[PDB]
Amino acid sequence: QFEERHLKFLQQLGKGNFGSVEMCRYDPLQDNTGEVVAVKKLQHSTEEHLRDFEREIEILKSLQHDNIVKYKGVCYSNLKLIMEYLPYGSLRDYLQKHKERIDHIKLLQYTSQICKGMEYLGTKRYIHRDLATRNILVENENRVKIGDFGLTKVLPQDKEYYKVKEPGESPIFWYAPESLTESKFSVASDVWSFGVVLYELFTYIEKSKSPPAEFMRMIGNDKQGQMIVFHLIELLKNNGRLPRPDGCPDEIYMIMTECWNNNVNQRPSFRDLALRVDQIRDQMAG
Ligand SMILES: CC(C)(C)c1nc2c3ccc(F)cc3c3c(=O)[nH]ccc3c2[nH]1
């Protein structure tokens, strides 16, 4: 395992849901030769959150894929999850800061990698429940990885959905309608959220174009608080949706809109999404 005393704090990397990630140097020889790693811990340790965190660690450990962040180990005294350090950070921040470097061809490369990571999740009957560019990490210019699994659940053997309603705040603007109305989560709801991820990427994370900002304008910024979810549900029911991003090819927007089907069963599979994206990639290449 990883020893507490040899883990040297460098900087705060990010915060998500109930967890917090830090950049640390694991230096067991105490000579400044150890590798830099990412360390996740609970911001406030609750027995409920500890049980969730334990399951999260088991989830990640069970995953080995090019497009999933690498598990390295755990640290015991206050449980800590040790992951590989991915030096380019979240895709959200990377894309926003370096939009001149990243073209549509690169966006589709990332899109394909996300789909392949998600198909791998589905093969283990894992539902991510929090697909968003903030949860995707960049290893290098050519490779992204699904980088957090704080909300990830395993499907029961006998059902194709999973019902969960967690205390606090949910990413409602990435949620499928049945996740908002029924608290139902499935591969199909992950596909819906993947549509939002695709939207995010093609907006190049322009602040005014974010899903929350766009939906809030459609709902009306003169919104309440508890009624926001109620109005969001109604908007989606009446086929109100995120607009086509500036400069987004019509065929890419079609993929988004097909992911955003109210009919759960009519949403494409991650396998078919990868196929469609890779086909568009090749047609943009030659
Ligand atoms: C906020 C969230 C929990 C999604 C998170 N942010 C990061 C992150 C941010 C910047 C950075 F340079 C690296 C990371 C990082 C990382 O390197 N490994 C695992 C997770 C993770 C991370 N996980």
XYZ file of N, CA and C in Angstrom, residues 23-285:
789
model
N -2.658 16.867 -5.535
C -1.398 16.480 -6.147
C -0.390 16.204 -5.036
N 0.145 14.988 -5.019
C 1.112 14.589 -4.004
C 2.312 13.884 -4.622
N 3.468 14.028 -3.982
C 4.643 13.251 -4.348
C 4.797 12.111 -3.348
N 4.711 10.875 -3.834
C 4.958 9.719 -2.980
C 6.446 9.414 -2.977
N 7.105 9.786 -1.883
C 8.561 9.767 -1.792
C 9.041 8.872 -0.636
N 8.945 7.534 -0.804
C 9.295 6.602 0.273
C 10.783 6.573 0.628
N 11.633 7.041 -0.282
C 13.071 7.118 -0.027
C 13.469 8.479 0.544
N 12.501 9.399 0.585
C 12.677 10.749 1.143
C 13.874 11.501 0.548
N 14.078 11.320 -0.756
C 15.200 11.920 -1.475
C 14.741 12.705 -2.707
N 13.430 12.938 -2.799
C 12.803 13.623 -3.936
C 13.035 12.889 -5.266
N 12.666 11.608 -5.291
C 12.751 10.780 -6.500
C 11.431 10.055 -6.774
N 10.506 10.135 -5.821
C 9.216 9.469 -5.940
C 8.336 10.067 -7.018
N 7.381 9.279 -7.499
C 6.467 9.748 -8.532
C 5.361 10.631 -7.957
N 4.931 11.605 -8.753
C 3.776 12.427 -8.423
C 2.512 11.617 -8.698
N 1.571 11.672 -7.761
C 0.311 10.948 -7.871
C -0.861 11.856 -7.505
N -2.071 11.414 -7.838
C -3.287 12.100 -7.434
C -3.919 11.353 -6.266
N -4.320 12.101 -5.244
C -4.856 11.507 -4.026
C -6.256 12.039 -3.768
N -7.231 11.135 -3.776
C -8.615 11.493 -3.494
C -9.007 11.083 -2.079
N -9.626 12.013 -1.358
C -10.216 11.723 -0.056
C -11.554 12.440 0.100
N -12.343 12.004 1.078
C -13.610 12.654 1.389
C -13.350 13.976 2.103
N -14.009 15.037 1.637
C -13.883 16.366 2.242
C -14.387 16.350 3.686
N -15.464 15.607 3.923
C -15.956 15.350 5.273
C -16.341 13.881 5.412
N -15.595 13.165 6.249
C -15.755 11.720 6.396
C -17.010 11.341 7.181
N -17.987 10.793 6.463
C -19.203 10.244 7.054
C -19.197 8.741 6.786
N -19.772 7.966 7.704
C -19.851 6.511 7.559
C -20.621 6.104 6.300
N -21.626 6.905 5.946
C -22.383 6.728 4.709
C -21.495 6.987 3.492
N -20.733 8.081 3.542
C -19.820 8.450 2.460
C -18.603 7.532 2.385
N -18.174 7.018 3.535
C -17.057 6.075 3.606
C -17.414 4.753 2.928
N -18.646 4.297 3.150
C -19.176 3.097 2.507
C -19.274 3.287 0.988
N -19.740 4.465 0.569
C -19.767 4.847 -0.844
C -18.359 4.888 -1.428
N -17.437 5.509 -0.690
C -16.047 5.655 -1.118
C -15.360 4.299 -1.268
N -15.631 3.386 -0.335
C -15.111 2.017 -0.399
C -15.566 1.297 -1.669
N -16.847 1.447 -2.005
C -17.401 0.897 -3.240
C -16.775 1.540 -4.478
N -16.606 2.862 -4.445
C -15.949 3.600 -5.528
C -14.551 3.049 -5.817
N -13.775 2.829 -4.758
C -12.422 2.290 -4.873
C -12.435 0.902 -5.519
N -13.376 0.060 -5.093
C -13.547 -1.270 -5.678
C -13.944 -1.202 -7.151
N -14.816 -0.251 -7.487
C -15.202 0.006 -8.878
C -13.965 0.298 -9.722
N -13.185 1.294 -9.308
C -12.025 1.746 -10.082
C -10.955 0.668 -10.217
N -10.706 -0.047 -9.121
C -9.748 -1.147 -9.097
C -10.124 -2.237 -10.106
N -11.428 -2.447 -10.290
C -11.942 -3.472 -11.199
C -11.869 -3.054 -12.671
N -11.513 -1.795 -12.913
C -11.465 -1.249 -14.265
C -10.030 -1.101 -14.764
N -9.745 -1.725 -15.903
C -8.455 -1.587 -16.575
C -8.689 -1.337 -18.061
N -8.503 -0.085 -18.468
C -8.801 0.352 -19.828
C -7.973 1.589 -20.140
N -7.572 1.726 -21.402
C -6.766 2.863 -21.862
C -7.425 4.213 -21.575
N -8.756 4.223 -21.534
C -9.510 5.461 -21.363
C -10.227 5.550 -20.020
N -9.646 4.897 -19.020
C -10.081 5.002 -17.635
C -8.849 5.261 -16.772
N -8.952 6.246 -15.881
C -7.849 6.630 -14.994
C -7.345 5.429 -14.185
N -6.026 5.295 -14.089
C -5.410 4.143 -13.433
C -5.467 4.207 -11.909
N -5.952 3.121 -11.315
C -5.874 2.899 -9.880
C -4.437 2.537 -9.517
N -3.916 3.155 -8.461
C -2.560 2.867 -7.996
C -2.534 2.171 -6.634
N -3.473 2.532 -5.766
C -3.548 1.956 -4.430
C -4.408 2.753 -3.469
N -4.335 2.381 -2.193
C -5.042 3.082 -1.124
C -4.092 3.476 0.005
N -4.492 4.480 0.780
C -3.724 4.921 1.937
C -4.587 4.851 3.191
N -4.091 4.132 4.196
C -4.778 3.972 5.478
C -4.006 4.643 6.610
N -4.739 5.147 7.601
C -4.139 5.746 8.796
C -3.488 4.686 9.680
N -9.007 7.450 7.979
C -9.050 8.396 6.869
C -8.568 7.781 5.550
N -9.505 7.161 4.834
C -9.205 6.430 3.608
C -8.859 7.389 2.473
N -7.793 7.070 1.747
C -7.392 7.846 0.582
C -7.204 6.946 -0.633
N -7.717 7.400 -1.775
C -7.558 6.697 -3.045
C -6.411 7.313 -3.833
N -5.436 6.479 -4.181
C -4.281 6.916 -4.955
C -4.476 6.534 -6.419
N -4.484 7.547 -7.279
C -4.621 7.359 -8.718
C -3.375 7.873 -9.419
N -3.222 7.510 -10.691
C -2.190 8.116 -11.531
C -2.456 9.617 -11.669
N -1.384 10.394 -11.760
C -1.501 11.826 -12.003
C -1.497 12.086 -13.501
N -2.568 12.713 -13.977
C -2.699 13.064 -15.384
C -2.448 14.560 -15.561
N -1.266 14.906 -16.105
C -0.681 16.246 -15.991
C -1.442 17.370 -16.702
N -2.322 17.025 -17.637
C -3.070 18.041 -18.376
C -4.422 18.398 -17.750
N -4.786 17.706 -16.671
C -5.993 18.024 -15.906
C -7.291 17.631 -16.581
N -8.394 18.243 -16.149
C -9.708 17.932 -16.717
C -9.841 18.461 -18.143
N -10.614 17.745 -18.958
C -10.889 18.136 -20.342
C -11.597 19.486 -20.392
N -12.468 19.725 -19.413
C -13.200 20.983 -19.282
C -12.252 22.185 -19.259
N -11.267 22.134 -18.362
C -10.282 23.206 -18.217
C -9.282 23.237 -19.367
N -8.866 22.057 -19.826
C -7.905 21.933 -20.924
C -8.444 22.523 -22.229
N -9.700 22.210 -22.542
C -10.348 22.687 -23.765
C -10.578 24.198 -23.747
N -11.031 24.708 -22.605
C -11.314 26.130 -22.426
C -10.055 26.989 -22.555
N -8.953 26.514 -21.977
C -7.692 27.257 -21.959
C -6.901 27.156 -23.260
N -7.124 26.087 -24.023
C -6.319 25.821 -25.220
C -7.153 25.538 -26.472
N -8.270 26.253 -26.595
C -9.225 26.086 -27.699
C -8.653 26.317 -29.105
N -7.564 27.082 -29.200
C -6.911 27.353 -30.488
C -6.169 26.126 -31.021
N -5.706 25.279 -30.104
C -4.933 24.083 -30.437
C -5.824 22.905 -30.840
N -7.045 22.880 -30.313
C -7.934 21.730 -30.461
C -8.988 21.956 -31.550
N -8.880 21.199 -32.640
C -9.854 21.284 -33.729
C -10.961 20.235 -33.588
N -11.915 20.261 -34.517
C -13.055 19.342 -34.504
C -12.649 17.876 -34.621
N -11.592 17.617 -35.391
C -11.040 16.268 -35.543
C -10.558 15.719 -34.194
N -9.886 16.565 -33.414
C -9.435 16.198 -32.069
C -10.599 15.991 -31.098
N -11.636 16.821 -31.228
C -12.841 16.688 -30.405
C -13.514 15.336 -30.618
N -13.487 14.855 -31.858
C -14.093 13.568 -32.189
C -13.216 12.399 -31.747
N -11.901 12.615 -31.733
C -10.974 11.635 -31.171
C -11.259 11.427 -29.678
N -11.415 12.529 -28.942
C -11.772 12.471 -27.522
C -13.132 11.809 -27.335
N -14.080 12.170 -28.198
C -15.445 11.637 -28.157
C -15.450 10.116 -28.296
N -14.667 9.619 -29.249
C -14.520 8.184 -29.489
C -13.950 7.465 -28.265
N -12.918 8.054 -27.665
C -12.275 7.498 -26.472
C -13.224 7.427 -25.274
N -14.052 8.458 -25.117
C -15.076 8.496 -24.069
C -16.107 7.374 -24.269
N -16.554 7.191 -25.513
C -17.496 6.121 -25.859
C -16.937 4.736 -25.571
N -15.659 4.537 -25.883
C -15.015 3.242 -25.679
C -14.829 2.942 -24.195
N -14.503 3.974 -23.418
C -14.444 3.857 -21.962
C -15.801 3.517 -21.367
N -16.847 4.157 -21.886
C -18.218 3.922 -21.426
C -18.768 2.549 -21.813
N -18.423 2.083 -23.011
C -18.807 0.737 -23.430
C -18.186 -0.290 -22.484
N -16.935 -0.049 -22.100
C -16.242 -0.894 -21.136
C -16.942 -0.897 -19.775
N -17.403 0.270 -19.321
C -18.200 0.360 -18.092
C -19.457 -0.498 -18.166
N -20.144 -0.420 -19.305
C -21.388 -1.150 -19.535
C -21.221 -2.655 -19.515
N -20.046 -3.120 -19.935
C -19.729 -4.544 -19.958
C -19.663 -5.116 -18.534
N -19.459 -4.237 -17.554
C -19.428 -4.635 -16.146
C -20.715 -4.219 -15.437
N -21.674 -3.733 -16.227
C -22.976 -3.258 -15.741
C -22.856 -2.077 -14.768
N -21.811 -1.274 -14.963
C -21.609 -0.049 -14.199
C -22.317 1.114 -14.885
N -23.019 1.919 -14.090
C -23.643 3.149 -14.572
C -22.886 4.318 -13.960
N -22.314 5.166 -14.810
C -21.454 6.256 -14.345
C -22.198 7.329 -13.545
N -23.327 7.792 -14.084
C -24.231 8.740 -13.407
C -23.733 10.186 -13.280
N -22.556 10.484 -13.831
C -21.956 11.817 -13.691
C -21.045 12.161 -14.881
N -21.426 11.703 -16.072
C -20.673 12.024 -17.282
C -20.745 13.508 -17.601
N -19.574 14.136 -17.615
C -19.412 15.561 -17.877
C -17.929 15.797 -18.134
N -17.599 16.793 -18.956
C -16.192 17.083 -19.276
C -15.325 17.382 -18.045
N -15.946 17.856 -16.966
C -15.236 18.089 -15.695
C -14.706 16.788 -15.079
N -15.314 15.668 -15.468
C -14.933 14.343 -14.976
C -14.088 13.534 -15.962
N -13.704 14.176 -17.061
C -12.791 13.588 -18.031
C -11.429 14.243 -17.838
N -10.378 13.431 -17.873
C -9.016 13.916 -17.687
C -8.193 13.723 -18.948
N -7.160 14.545 -19.093
C -6.326 14.536 -20.287
C -4.941 13.997 -19.931
N -4.591 12.837 -20.485
C -3.249 12.282 -20.300
C -2.250 13.013 -21.195
N -2.630 13.193 -22.456
C -1.853 13.968 -23.420
C -2.767 14.543 -24.500
N -2.172 15.229 -25.474
C -2.901 15.889 -26.561
C -3.816 14.935 -27.334
N -3.466 13.651 -27.326
C -4.175 12.639 -28.106
C -5.052 11.666 -27.305
N -4.938 11.680 -25.975
C -5.669 10.718 -25.138
C -6.379 11.333 -23.932
N -7.677 11.052 -23.819
C -8.455 11.397 -22.627
C -8.911 10.139 -21.874
N -9.253 10.311 -20.599
C -9.698 9.207 -19.750
C -10.858 9.651 -18.874
N -11.818 8.756 -18.667
C -12.850 8.980 -17.658
C -12.121 8.956 -16.315
N -12.240 10.044 -15.557
C -11.335 10.300 -14.435
C -11.894 10.298 -13.025
N -13.203 10.104 -12.893
C -13.838 10.052 -11.579
C -15.029 9.113 -11.598
N -15.263 8.435 -10.476
C -16.347 7.455 -10.376
C -17.123 7.565 -9.060
N -17.195 8.784 -8.526
C -17.844 9.055 -7.243
C -19.317 8.697 -7.153
N -20.020 8.751 -8.283
C -21.459 8.472 -8.322
C -21.809 7.161 -9.034
N -20.781 6.398 -9.400
C -20.943 5.178 -10.191
C -21.588 4.046 -9.386
N -22.629 3.446 -9.961
C -23.361 2.350 -9.325
C -23.327 1.091 -10.189
N -23.509 -0.065 -9.555
C -23.628 -1.329 -10.277
C -25.106 -1.663 -10.404
N -25.530 -2.031 -11.612
C -26.899 -2.489 -11.836
C -27.180 -3.753 -11.024
N -28.418 -3.893 -10.515
C -28.816 -5.184 -9.948
C -28.932 -6.222 -11.063
N -28.760 -7.497 -10.720
C -28.793 -8.582 -11.706
C -30.094 -8.631 -12.510
N -31.208 -8.325 -11.847
C -32.544 -8.531 -12.410
C -33.159 -7.299 -13.088
N -32.446 -6.173 -13.070
C -32.973 -4.918 -13.617
C -31.962 -4.172 -14.489
N -32.473 -3.414 -15.457
C -31.630 -2.646 -16.375
C -31.519 -1.171 -15.991
N -32.134 -0.813 -14.866
C -32.034 0.534 -14.311
C -31.658 0.452 -12.833
N -31.269 1.592 -12.269
C -30.905 1.688 -10.862
C -31.507 2.972 -10.303
N -32.290 2.833 -9.237
C -32.943 3.969 -8.597
C -32.140 4.466 -7.400
N -31.777 5.745 -7.438
C -31.019 6.375 -6.360
C -31.314 7.873 -6.293
N -31.561 8.355 -5.079
C -31.774 9.775 -4.825
C -30.878 10.207 -3.667
N -29.754 10.823 -4.013
C -28.749 11.226 -3.034
C -29.045 12.606 -2.446
N -28.735 12.800 -1.148
C -28.882 14.113 -0.514
C -27.930 15.150 -1.109
N -28.357 16.410 -1.102
C -27.551 17.504 -1.636
C -27.933 17.886 -3.052
N -26.936 18.299 -3.831
C -27.166 18.814 -5.180
C -26.757 17.820 -6.264
N -27.614 17.686 -7.274
C -27.357 16.819 -8.417
C -27.073 17.643 -9.675
N -26.274 17.089 -10.610
C -26.041 17.754 -11.893
C -27.254 17.617 -12.821
N -28.351 18.270 -12.441
C -29.646 18.139 -13.122
C -29.641 18.490 -14.617
N -28.723 19.358 -15.036
C -28.660 19.780 -16.436
C -27.916 18.791 -17.344
N -27.428 17.703 -16.749
C -26.839 16.587 -17.489
C -27.748 15.358 -17.416
N -28.799 15.457 -16.605
C -29.703 14.341 -16.315
C -30.718 14.072 -17.421
N -30.941 12.790 -17.697
C -32.037 12.346 -18.554
C -33.368 12.621 -17.841
N -34.472 12.780 -18.604
C -35.771 13.106 -17.996
C -36.231 12.083 -16.953
N -35.989 10.798 -17.218
C -36.388 9.731 -16.297
C -35.516 9.687 -15.037
N -34.330 10.289 -15.110
C -33.481 10.463 -13.930
C -33.991 11.610 -13.060
N -34.626 12.591 -13.697
C -35.201 13.740 -12.995
C -36.543 13.401 -12.356
N -37.365 12.649 -13.086
C -38.737 12.353 -12.675
C -38.863 11.101 -11.815
N -38.049 10.091 -12.114
C -38.175 8.773 -11.490
C -36.915 8.330 -10.741
N -35.850 9.130 -10.839
C -34.538 8.796 -10.262
C -33.959 7.500 -10.843
N -34.304 7.221 -12.098
C -33.863 6.017 -12.797
C -32.562 6.267 -13.548
N -31.568 5.422 -13.289
C -30.270 5.525 -13.945
C -29.919 4.216 -14.637
N -29.401 4.334 -15.855
C -29.152 3.194 -16.726
C -28.087 3.565 -17.747
N -27.653 2.581 -18.534
C -26.761 2.840 -19.663
C -27.368 3.925 -20.560
N -28.680 3.847 -20.782
C -29.396 4.827 -21.599
C -29.353 6.247 -21.022
N -29.366 6.368 -19.695
C -29.219 7.680 -19.063
C -27.777 8.197 -19.165
N -26.802 7.286 -19.101
C -25.403 7.623 -19.395
C -25.255 8.137 -20.833
N -25.961 7.502 -21.771
C -25.978 7.944 -23.177
C -26.537 9.364 -23.319
N -27.645 9.653 -22.630
C -28.195 11.011 -22.599
C -27.122 12.011 -22.170
N -26.494 11.748 -21.023
C -25.431 12.605 -20.494
C -24.242 12.701 -21.448
N -23.935 11.603 -22.137
C -22.904 11.633 -23.176
C -23.238 12.648 -24.278
N -24.520 12.760 -24.624
C -24.983 13.792 -25.557
C -24.645 15.195 -25.076
N -24.809 15.421 -23.773
C -24.472 16.706 -23.152
C -22.957 16.938 -23.181
N -22.185 15.882 -22.918
C -20.722 15.935 -23.036
C -20.300 16.360 -24.446
N -20.909 15.747 -25.461
C -20.642 16.107 -26.856
C -20.977 17.573 -27.127
N -22.126 18.020 -26.620
C -22.501 19.432 -26.659
C -21.419 20.309 -26.026
N -21.016 19.971 -24.799
C -19.967 20.708 -24.081
C -18.730 20.910 -24.950
N -18.235 19.814 -25.517
C -17.004 19.822 -26.307
C -17.074 20.780 -27.491
N -18.197 20.759 -28.202
C -18.355 21.596 -29.386
C -18.682 23.062 -29.077
N -19.049 23.350 -27.827
C -19.148 24.739 -27.365
C -17.782 25.300 -26.964
N -16.771 24.430 -26.919
C -15.427 24.781 -26.424
C -15.452 25.418 -25.026
N -16.424 24.986 -24.222
C -16.661 25.472 -22.853
C -16.783 27.005 -22.759
N -17.468 27.606 -23.730
C -17.783 29.031 -23.669
C -18.780 29.253 -22.533
N -18.420 30.140 -21.609
C -19.132 30.307 -20.336
C -20.643 30.488 -20.489
N -21.046 31.341 -21.430
C -22.463 31.619 -21.678
C -23.203 30.459 -22.353
N -22.452 29.496 -22.885
C -23.028 28.380 -23.640
C -23.170 27.087 -22.832
N -22.788 27.119 -21.556
C -22.875 25.936 -20.692
C -24.314 25.423 -20.580
N -24.489 24.093 -20.437
C -25.819 23.531 -20.194
C -26.638 24.251 -19.106
N -26.051 24.517 -17.911
C -26.833 25.277 -16.933
C -27.283 26.645 -17.447
N -26.369 27.403 -18.056
C -26.686 28.737 -18.574
C -27.753 28.712 -19.673
N -27.656 27.734 -20.573
C -28.601 27.594 -21.685
C -30.002 27.196 -21.222
N -30.084 26.161 -20.386
C -31.364 25.707 -19.843
C -32.036 26.778 -18.978
N -31.242 27.480 -18.168
C -31.760 28.553 -17.311
C -32.351 29.715 -18.109
N -31.789 29.981 -19.286
C -32.337 30.991 -20.192
C -33.650 30.534 -20.823
N -33.704 29.262 -21.216
C -34.909 28.670 -21.797
C -36.039 28.566 -20.771
N -35.678 28.201 -19.542
C -36.612 28.156 -18.414
C -37.001 29.575 -17.993
N -36.033 30.486 -18.061
C -36.215 31.863 -17.620
C -35.418 32.094 -16.355
N -34.438 32.994 -16.431
C -33.564 33.312 -15.293
C -34.317 33.862 -14.078
N -35.559 34.288 -14.306
C -36.480 34.670 -13.235
C -37.058 33.431 -12.537
N -36.256 32.367 -12.485
C -36.662 31.090 -11.902
C -36.642 31.121 -10.376
N -37.262 30.111 -9.772
C -37.332 29.990 -8.320
C -36.133 29.191 -7.797
N -36.402 28.113 -7.064
C -35.348 27.261 -6.518
C -35.703 25.791 -6.625
N -36.742 25.391 -5.898
C -37.240 24.016 -5.924
C -38.033 23.736 -7.201
N -38.491 24.806 -7.851
C -39.286 24.707 -9.076
C -38.434 24.602 -10.344
N -37.128 24.835 -10.210
C -36.187 24.755 -11.337
C -36.214 23.371 -11.993
N -36.174 22.327 -11.167
C -36.251 20.944 -11.641
C -37.594 20.682 -12.335
N -38.672 21.203 -11.750
C -40.022 21.051 -12.298
C -40.160 21.669 -13.692
N -39.577 22.852 -13.878
C -39.616 23.537 -15.169
C -38.682 22.887 -16.188
N -37.560 22.352 -15.707
C -36.624 21.617 -16.556
C -37.279 20.354 -17.113
N -37.987 19.630 -16.249
C -38.731 18.434 -16.645
C -39.729 18.753 -17.760
N -40.479 19.840 -17.588
C -41.493 20.256 -18.561
C -40.882 20.663 -19.900
N -39.764 21.387 -19.844
C -39.045 21.806 -21.048
C -38.612 20.604 -21.890
N -38.032 19.600 -21.232
C -37.570 18.386 -21.909
C -38.728 17.535 -22.436
N -39.838 17.533 -21.700
C -41.058 16.833 -22.105
C -41.616 17.397 -23.416
N -41.520 18.715 -23.578
C -41.984 19.397 -24.785
C -40.902 19.528 -25.861
N -39.912 18.635 -25.800
C -38.797 18.571 -26.754
C -37.940 19.841 -26.861
N -37.857 20.581 -25.757
C -36.909 21.683 -25.636
C -35.538 21.101 -25.359
N -34.531 21.592 -26.076
C -33.183 21.038 -25.979
C -32.090 22.077 -26.191
N -30.885 21.735 -25.738
C -29.692 22.539 -25.971
C -29.529 22.807 -27.465
N -29.181 24.055 -27.827
C -29.042 24.406 -29.236
C -27.798 23.781 -29.853
N -27.741 23.782 -31.180
C -26.544 23.390 -31.903
C -25.429 24.395 -31.590
N -24.285 23.911 -31.063
C -23.142 24.795 -30.795
C -22.659 25.529 -32.046
N -22.097 26.721 -31.856
C -21.545 27.503 -32.961
C -20.487 26.687 -33.700
N -20.670 26.539 -35.010
C -19.723 25.815 -35.854
C -19.820 24.297 -35.853
N -20.754 23.748 -35.078
C -20.929 22.298 -34.990
C -21.545 21.727 -36.270
N -20.892 20.709 -36.872
C -21.435 20.065 -38.071
C -22.801 19.444 -37.794
N -23.687 19.513 -38.783
C -25.060 19.051 -38.627
C -25.129 17.579 -38.217
N -24.236 16.767 -38.784
C -24.152 15.338 -38.465
C -23.725 15.052 -37.021
N -22.957 15.965 -36.429
C -22.556 15.841 -35.028
C -23.721 16.222 -34.118
N -24.437 17.287 -34.478
C -25.632 17.695 -33.738
C -26.710 16.610 -33.742
N -26.814 15.882 -34.855
C -27.758 14.767 -34.973
C -27.480 13.685 -33.927
N -26.198 13.401 -33.687
C -25.784 12.440 -32.662
C -26.253 12.899 -31.279
N -26.021 14.177 -30.976
C -26.505 14.807 -29.745
C -28.014 14.642 -29.578
N -28.772 15.013 -30.610
C -30.236 14.979 -30.538
C -30.788 13.560 -30.396
N -30.101 12.593 -31.001
C -30.473 11.184 -30.885
C -30.183 10.621 -29.488
N -29.128 11.124 -28.851
C -28.842 10.794 -27.453
C -29.902 11.390 -26.529
N -30.431 12.553 -26.909
C -31.459 13.229 -26.127
C -32.883 12.823 -26.518
N -33.099 11.527 -26.712
C -34.439 11.012 -26.966
C -35.155 10.798 -25.640
N -36.383 11.303 -25.542
C -37.236 11.060 -24.380
C -37.511 9.569 -24.190
N -37.603 8.844 -25.302
C -37.794 7.400 -25.271
C -36.475 6.702 -24.966
N -36.364 6.214 -23.734
C -35.149 5.591 -23.208
C -34.569 4.533 -24.156
N -35.443 3.685 -24.694
C -35.045 2.569 -25.549
C -34.576 2.963 -26.953
N -34.839 4.208 -27.345
C -34.509 4.682 -28.689
C -33.140 5.358 -28.781
N -32.483 5.526 -27.638
C -31.142 6.107 -27.605
C -30.126 5.099 -28.136
N -29.145 5.569 -28.933
C -28.113 4.674 -29.468
C -27.260 4.013 -28.381
N -26.642 2.886 -28.717
C -25.693 2.240 -27.823
C -24.350 2.963 -27.907
N -23.508 2.792 -26.888
C -22.160 3.363 -26.918
C -21.310 2.776 -28.042
N -21.519 1.495 -28.330
C -20.844 0.829 -29.438
C -21.176 1.483 -30.788
N -22.460 1.759 -31.017
C -22.911 2.393 -32.260
C -22.492 3.856 -32.343
N -22.459 4.527 -31.194
C -21.964 5.900 -31.113
C -20.506 5.975 -31.549
N -19.683 5.066 -31.026
C -18.274 4.967 -31.414
C -18.125 4.736 -32.918
N -18.954 3.844 -33.461
C -18.950 3.525 -34.889
C -19.277 4.745 -35.744
N -20.334 5.459 -35.363
C -20.772 6.656 -36.076
C -19.733 7.774 -36.009
N -19.173 7.989 -34.821
C -18.131 8.997 -34.614
C -16.864 8.674 -35.415
N -16.400 7.426 -35.333
C -15.205 6.984 -36.065
C -15.378 7.071 -37.579
N -16.608 6.861 -38.045
C -16.941 7.001 -39.463
C -16.842 8.462 -39.908
N -17.354 9.372 -39.080
C -17.283 10.810 -39.352
C -15.833 11.307 -39.285
N -15.068 10.767 -38.335
C -13.631 11.036 -38.222
C -12.882 10.722 -39.518
N -13.160 9.548 -40.087
C -12.512 9.091 -41.321
C -12.913 9.918 -42.541
N -14.167 10.365 -42.567
C -14.684 11.191 -43.659
C -14.156 12.626 -43.591
N -13.729 13.042 -42.400
C -13.100 14.347 -42.204
C -11.592 14.290 -42.459
N -11.033 13.082 -42.419
C -9.596 12.871 -42.593
C -9.175 12.910 -44.062
